[PDB]
Amino acid sequence: DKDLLKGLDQEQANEVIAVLQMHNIEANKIDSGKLGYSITVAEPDFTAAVYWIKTYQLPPRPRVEIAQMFPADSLVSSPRAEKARLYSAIEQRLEQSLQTMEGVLSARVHISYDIDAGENGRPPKPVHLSALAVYERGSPLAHQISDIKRFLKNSFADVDYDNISVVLSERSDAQLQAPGTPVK
Amino acid sequence: DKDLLKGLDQEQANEVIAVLQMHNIEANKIDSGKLGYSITVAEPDFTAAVYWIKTYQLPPRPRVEIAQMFPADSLVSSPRAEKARLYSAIEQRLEQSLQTMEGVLSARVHISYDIDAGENGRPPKPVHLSALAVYERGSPLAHQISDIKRFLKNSFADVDYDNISVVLSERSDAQLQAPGTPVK
Amino acid sequence: DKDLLKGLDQEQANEVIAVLQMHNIEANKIDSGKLGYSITVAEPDFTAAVYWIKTYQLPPRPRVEIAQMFPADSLVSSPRAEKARLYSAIEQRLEQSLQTMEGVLSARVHISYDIDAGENGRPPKPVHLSALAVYERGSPLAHQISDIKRFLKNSFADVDYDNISVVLSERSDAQLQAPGTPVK
Amino acid sequence: DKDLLKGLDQEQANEVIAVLQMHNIEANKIDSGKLGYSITVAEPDFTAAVYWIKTYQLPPRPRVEIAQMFPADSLVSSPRAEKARLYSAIEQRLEQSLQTMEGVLSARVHISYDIDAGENGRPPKPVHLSALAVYERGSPLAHQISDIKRFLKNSFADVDYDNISVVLSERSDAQLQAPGTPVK
Amino acid sequence: AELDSLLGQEKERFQVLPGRDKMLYVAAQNERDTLWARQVLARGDYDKNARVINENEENKRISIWLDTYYPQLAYYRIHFDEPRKPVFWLSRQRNTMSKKELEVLSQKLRALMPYADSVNITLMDDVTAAGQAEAGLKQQALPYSRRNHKGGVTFVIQGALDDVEILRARQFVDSYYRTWGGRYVQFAIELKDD
Amino acid sequence: AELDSLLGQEKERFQVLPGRDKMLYVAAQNERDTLWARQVLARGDYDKNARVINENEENKRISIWLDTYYPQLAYYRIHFDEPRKPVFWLSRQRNTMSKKELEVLSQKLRALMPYADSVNITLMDDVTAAGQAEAGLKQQALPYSRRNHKGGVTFVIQGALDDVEILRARQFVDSYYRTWGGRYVQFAIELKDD
Amino acid sequence: AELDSLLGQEKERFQVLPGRDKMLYVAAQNERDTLWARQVLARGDYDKNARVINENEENKRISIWLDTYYPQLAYYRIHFDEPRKPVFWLSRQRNTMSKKELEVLSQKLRALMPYADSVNITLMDDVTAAGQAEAGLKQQALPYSRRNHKGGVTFVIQGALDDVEILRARQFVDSYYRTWGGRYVQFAIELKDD
Amino acid sequence: AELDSLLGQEKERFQVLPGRDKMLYVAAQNERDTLWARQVLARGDYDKNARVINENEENKRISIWLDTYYPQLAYYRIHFDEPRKPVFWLSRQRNTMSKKELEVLSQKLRALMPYADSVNITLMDDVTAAGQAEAGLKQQALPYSRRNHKGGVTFVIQGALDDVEILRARQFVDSYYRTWGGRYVQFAIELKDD
């Protein structure tokens, strides 16, 4: 019955419980209205519960993307700002599209940004990409490394296959057991 | 009777149930008026229900398209903004048209964007495309990979067949069984 | 008696029923006044009804066309905006005209757009077209692929027959049986 | 029952307890409303508790990033400010993406900044990167030093593998024991 | 309530077969009618055991069985035009099985399918399987290229093709894959420019 | 409550095997149905001991056992088409084990699997394992390159490839890895430009 | 309360071994399940002495003991596939220990591990340890370079490598380090440009 | 209250040794657990005299004693794998001490450590100390340079090095400094450009 986090949001609270239940301590999510959520664990498990907050850097800061810093509410805009807000929405759209392939669970894509491509008379340099993936297990993931590498090739102007690197792994082993209350 | 998500919208709630019913836990969708929906599962299945939220990154963030960041409500506009808002509506219209072919259930199309085509005296580079598809099963999907590749060829200025890559698969096996309440 | 969608519009509701009645579950359309419609299915069929919402991406987002993003209510206009609003109305008019041929039930036409045709001193490139069709069955649809290809040839400045690709199919087999209530 | 810190925030308080419980003294976190938290330790352990505040420089000052000093609320902006606010959000996004690889717990990425690249007629110099990581133990971390070094290569314009240096280690040994109250 | 009334209004698209392992099977003729009958057996308004077997899926089920116990067997396809007496097509020029163990092969395919009474194994000429695939392809006036090798033949169709030459292609492939199956001759529709 | 009613509505996708060490096993046929049955045994609505064994995962479990006590053994894959009598494929041309200790190998694989009654060890020809991998690959009209060496063979597929030539590739790899396993011949789909 | 009920719902992932020094050991099979069982013994809901031993960490514990009392000993790895009778692999061509003190080596490894009954020391051929590391590496089609010297061998892999050639690398390293250990042959994946 | 209950929950990481000068010692195995046990003895909840001795710090304590009374002695390191009978490693080829005063050296190291019963002085071969440091260094594929001289050897490692070649370096240095100590051979990781 000892608090360790309070004032959390919704997705910040449903993941801390997924961390603590993986390491065999049982947590409770208590709603508190407009003040956000709060997480309390048992008193014999309070020492271990603080150590797995420091280690995983919990609670999660919200995920930051490039268009959040170049907002559309500005009165004026620059050609540097419109390009970095355009590539920031292609980059979000490609990871929305990798999640609908067979067996993919999550994905993150990165795009190389050109800032002084046309501002000093350079030709624009070639585009590079990189991707991550977390597959459902049982899949021969040595062979599905080429379908991502084919799908991402002709989604831009001119890339090569030696310029795309996708790094993928299988998901962790499932947690289906209740943790267990400390018997006193 | 333990909450795990609340404040959801309509399409964010009808998919989380489709996730949890696939993994043999039964969820309930409780309306709460103007505060959005909420999803509660049984108490023996609360551990497994949190693990399949962290894995699939649920609830789904809404799908982001290029025209949402270059709005028409601006007082001024640029030639960079009008081209990226035009290609963003051809890209939505092509995936509206792939869903009416025989056997297609969902599709996503991507277009390569030119930003300094005419701003520095370049000729405009060739257009590349890429597409996804989820077919109804039983279809010989080695042969329907050319009809998409023919339909997308002369929808633009000048593409080649080595510049269009469509990657498609069959849908997953159907879920028609009720999950089953935990007997206590 | 379990809801799965509410707040729908008219054409979004008459199609979800056409999806669910094809897969042998019976749905009911309940009007609710100014709040839109709502669809409820039986309680033994609730598991299958959620799976066919996730698969077909229901409810349908409204069909998007190019003139919806370049509105006529703007105070100023550009030559890039007037051309893309003109081709967007030829493209709607051609699919209104394919539906009145014999045996055609639905059609969708696409036009290739020129954006920097005259803005940098290029000659305007040749126009490409593409079309879809869903025929009434019993028709020899190997022979009616040339009448569409003749009708679309001289509707523009100068196209060739190797630049028009029409891809057509026959409609699906008819659903005329009542689904059947779950006997308990 | 002697105070040593008061007025702390939430994440400043859940880490000082993780420091003091690692060195076998037991601390208590007392909420005090809108005045922030406060940490009190036992009276025989007050000497050791002050020494581990001076050594680790506790409480933690909040983590400082480049975009906090070039805010978007300014009326005017410069090309020097927009580039250093763009690289500051790529740098945050790359460390959000390293935390979802298998076995990674925390990561920090740094980017080399160009300030007079185009302001005096230089060509822009090559981009350098550097990264840190804290792995879950049991992993052969001599082999996962190349997957980070492959993922970070084509996330920018043109880097080389002799320009990326990632330095990683395994996490410390776990603290799962209660410290123990001073018997008097 | 007998199962033939729990199905649709027409008692025509579904034919109900009594099994041998005290189970009662439902035979549908395409994939869309399989999900019609599997929805009934999944909501649970039938007290006994039942299945839904399909013409396409009962082929892929015992092709897994036959790829484990009897490898190196050259067969074509199993036809269910009457489901109580299925026909097992089998190649003639590529097997040396005698008269006696062909009866053993039939008496074990009977054990996989409890709805069948006997399996009629016939042997057909192997040259005519590649004969109808070529003579039917020259009739459609399509460009092609034959590549003979040991244990199979393949037909390669490339080049820039208008839709008259790939609509007639896909109607001939899907009507040939139904009859002979895709284990001896496989088509290659690759559409590239020149 | 017997376990075959605690599972789904169809008593068809799951087959329940009585063990020998007073435990009761559940055999699922793919990975998605393994998480269906492991969710039941983890919420704890069964008073006795039970497991869920999978066709893929029961191979990787006793491949760890067989890589410790019997090294240098050339085997292919274990098939569970009927789970009470599994089939242990074994290479012929790369082992010199006599008649007597092949019985000892079977009587110790029986001890690892309490649900099985006997393990049928068969010996198959090693040349035909590389024969079906090549003759099936020329039928798909794919470019390749054979690299023979002692104790294994590999097929390298590089070059710029359109999606017709890598969709037919991945459907042939995954249907070949199910039958023969990836211990003797391993494919190399590397997609680079030129 | 016996300890096998204080653990999780499945009494399957944990096997409880009675010791010899009046202590009761818990054997987990990976690192994530070690922190599951050490959390139970640390909150203190067990009145007696207990430990959690891991397959990886019980190797690194008595490798410290064996690097102090018996230096210059060429060994490979200790396998715990059944924990009551562990197997101590030992090199043949690099030691001159006679028959008698190999019994002395086994009777002192028994004293380090109170859960074991006897330690089975076996001698294996040293050439085949470098034989499977090379023949498994040519099968993955990777560039390499062998550097033989006295008392060990190393494989150097450099050059610009795409992800097909470093995903197949890291899956072969981690499956080889589990079997043979990293004391005789060590791999060198260094990724630089050219 | 006996001291083994005033420590943590596990009575496993700390082993309590009865002394000989009416003091009671606590042996910890790393530096972090030394501050755990010294915090107990400093708040003063024990009525008798106690210490906390560490494996690293009990070496540096009597290396000061041995650098005053017995200079010019070539020794390596003292191991405490069992603390009641420590092992004093000693070089063979660099000392001319006879049989009798080696007993005198052991009977005075016993007087420094009241927790020990006897000190076992052994003599080891000096060439193999520089043998394992070089053969272990060629296995990691690192560039180096040997500089032999009288009374010691040193290994110089310079040049521009990526992190694969300095992560494998620092894992080999710290595992070698634990066994042999840094009195005969000392490594030189100097990282400069070229």
Numbering used by the authors:
A (entry chain e), B (entry chain f), C (entry chain g), D (entry chain d): 20 to 203
E (entry chain I), F (entry chain H), G (entry chain G), H (entry chain F): 171 to 364
Give the original sentences from the paper that presented this experimental model.
The 24-fold features of the IM rings in the C1 reconstruction were clearly visible and further C24 symmetry averaging resulted in a reconstruction to 3.6 Å resolution (compared to 4.3 Å for the basal body IM rings; EMD-8398) allowing for refinement of the atomic structures of the periplasmic domains of PrgH171–364 and PrgK20–203. Consistent with the conserved dimensions of the IM rings between the needle complex here and that of the previous basal body reconstructions, the refined PrgH and PrgK ring atomic models determined from each overlap closely (overall Cα RMSD 0.7 Å) suggesting an inherently highly stable structure with no significant conformational change required in this region upon needle assembly. The N-terminal N0 and N1 domains, outer β-barrel and C-terminal surface exposed S domain conversely show very little structural difference between assembly states; as with the static IM ring components they appear to provide a highly stable scaffold or shell to buttress the inner conformational changes required for needle passage.
The injectisome is a specialized bacterial organelle that utilizes a type III secretion system (T3SS) to translocate effector proteins from the bacterial cytosol directly into a eukaryotic host. Composed of >20 different proteins, the injectisome forms a syringe shaped nanomachine that spans both bacterial membranes and that of the infected host. The major structural unit of the injectisome is the basal body, composed of three highly oligomerized concentric rings spanning the bacterial inner membrane (IM) (PrgH and PrgK in the Salmonella enterica serovar Typhimurium SPI-1 T3SS)3–6 and outer membrane (OM)7 (InvG, a member of the secretin family of OM pores also found in the type II secretion system, type IV pili system, as well as the phage assembly system). To address this and further elucidate the structural basis for injectisome assembly and function, including that of the central needle component, we have conducted here a cryo-EM analysis of the assembled native needle complex resulting in 3D reconstructions of the IM and OM rings at resolutions permitting atomic model building (3.6 Å and 3.9 Å, respectively) and the 3D reconstruction of an isolated helical needle filament at 3.3 Å resolution.
